[PDB]
Design a binder for this molecule. Sequence first.
Ligand SMILES: Cc1cc2nc3c(=O)[nH]c(=O)nc-3n(C[C@H](O)[C@H](O)[C@H](O)COP(=O)(O)OP(=O)(O)OC[C@H]3O[C@@H](n4cnc5c(N)ncnc54)[C@H](O)[C@@H]3O)c2cc1C
Ligand SMILES: Nc1nc(=O)c2c([nH]1)NC[C@@H]1CN(c3ccc(C(=O)N[C@@H](CCC(=O)O)C(=O)O)cc3)CN21
Length: 492
Amino acid sequence: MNDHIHRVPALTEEEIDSVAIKTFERYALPSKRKGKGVTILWFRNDLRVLDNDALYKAWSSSDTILPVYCLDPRLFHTTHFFNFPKTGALRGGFLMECLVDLRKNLMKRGLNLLIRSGKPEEILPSLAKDFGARTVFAHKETCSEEVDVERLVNQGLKRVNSTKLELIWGSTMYHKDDLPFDVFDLPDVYTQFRKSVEAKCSIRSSTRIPLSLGPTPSVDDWGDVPTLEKLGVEPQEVTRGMRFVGGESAGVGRVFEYFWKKDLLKVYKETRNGMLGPDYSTKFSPWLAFGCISPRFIYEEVQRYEKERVANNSTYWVLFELIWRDYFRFLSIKCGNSLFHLGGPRNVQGKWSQDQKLFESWRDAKTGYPLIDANMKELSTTGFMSNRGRQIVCSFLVRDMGLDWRMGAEWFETCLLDYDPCSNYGNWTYGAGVGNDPREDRYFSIPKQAQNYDPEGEYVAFWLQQLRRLPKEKRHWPGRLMYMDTVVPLKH
Ligand SMILES: Cc1cc2nc3c(=O)[nH]c(=O)nc-3n(C[C@H](O)[C@H](O)[C@H](O)COP(=O)(O)OP(=O)(O)OC[C@H]3O[C@@H](n4cnc5c(N)ncnc54)[C@H](O)[C@@H]3O)c2cc1C
Ligand SMILES: Nc1nc(=O)c2c([nH]1)NC[C@@H]1CN(c3ccc(C(=O)N[C@@H](CCC(=O)O)C(=O)O)cc3)CN21
């Protein structure tokens, strides 16, 4: 049944393990450790061992480490404004896989992974007291929901006050402390930010981790990774398109696959606007979202590729694209919750429709427009959508359907494996024209976009069976009778 189903990476479990081992070794910290006492390493979206500063700082300042992951109940409630599931089944499955792999990789280094179900502010203070932990390490987050959790955990520790919460920044290519400006003065135009950081910042080298990470505390029950039904979520199968394999191993496997095995890095720029297949682009996003791989690691591999293979505009463009990710992270700090408001960071006034019927046709891939439906179907079936497609469906929902852009944003939040509040709401803000950079505040012509990015209509055909046997031109505009009625006319 795995017909037209593409495993990402395509590598077999065996190949992934092999590639992962040699990657770990290539970056291993040569055979020192001072520190003292016990320390708790709280994960949350940085599910990897490699370039992990929180892990290093933890090991560097202790005798024994207790790595922990809390399955936050809130993660499986509903979305903010329109109440879609907080985490869709596909991303949930990806997460479980990430935890399985993280535990495996941690055990390889003499550690393990304590899995607990509950709120971090309740679990961590308890564990800190039970093991007499001196500190709790973890990465610093930026959006309000995550920052609020940090506050609660911090106050929880004090409420019990011999354990300090140590939040380490580390999720971007360029470090926050190395920027040419304070985040409050982040340029509102990406171009200004990009040029500025490229010329005045320099990227830090990846943090090398020892192959042996000392012992863990005693612990009589490390728990286990839940099924999903146990979490109130019903497993979902990818029936066509890309599946995506969770975990750092698979992630490092994809970098290897895209750069070295397939040698596609040198042509990335000329294919990045594709919409069909795993080859047109990196496909790193889901692993970057859960922190299974880091941008600094990617940068090092790009440099090694430019040193051993070739260097051109394509090898560079992957970095250019990672600066977009960095930009939205910093933007989330400067914008705060205005990133989530209807008026956006520019607080634009006006009214938008929340027409349930219209939104449902968009979400259900039944708008009558092949280019639109194909993308929406890919999204709900695989949890991924090309950048080109995301831009298009955003323009369509906002401009053509005139719907509250947040309805589209939250649906993306439910479905995307690579969902990230900064990137998601950041880009939606751009496309919906409610941000402070007019770059994407225009209009995407479905007919033009379809012709330029899917001339043979093979993308739309791959997803919409009704168009499989139709000629090139019919795939672009099949007509209501050969496809279905259009839920709304085109144009503002
Ligand atoms: C309306 C809209 C909403 C989006 N919401 C999210 C989201 O919640 N999470 C998410 O990870 N991506 C989001 N994107 C992502 C962008 O389209 C994807 O980051 C890129 O397609 C992801 O992987 P790739 O392999 O296709 O990219 P390439 O293969 O294009 O890889 C470039 C890498 O750089 C980063 N990147 C590329 N483009 C962007 C961008 N425009 N903004 C931020 N980072 C970028 C990613 O980490 C990506 O893996 C959104 C795009 C739009 C238009
Ligand atoms: N990963 C992630 N982190 C988040 O913080 C987050 C998401 N995802 N998904 C979308 C929701 C919604 N976002 C929001 C939206 C609005 C406010 C807000 O209006 N706050 C008010 C005060 C509200 C109150 O006091 O009840 C404010 O003035 O800022 C906050 C967070 C945060 N969200």
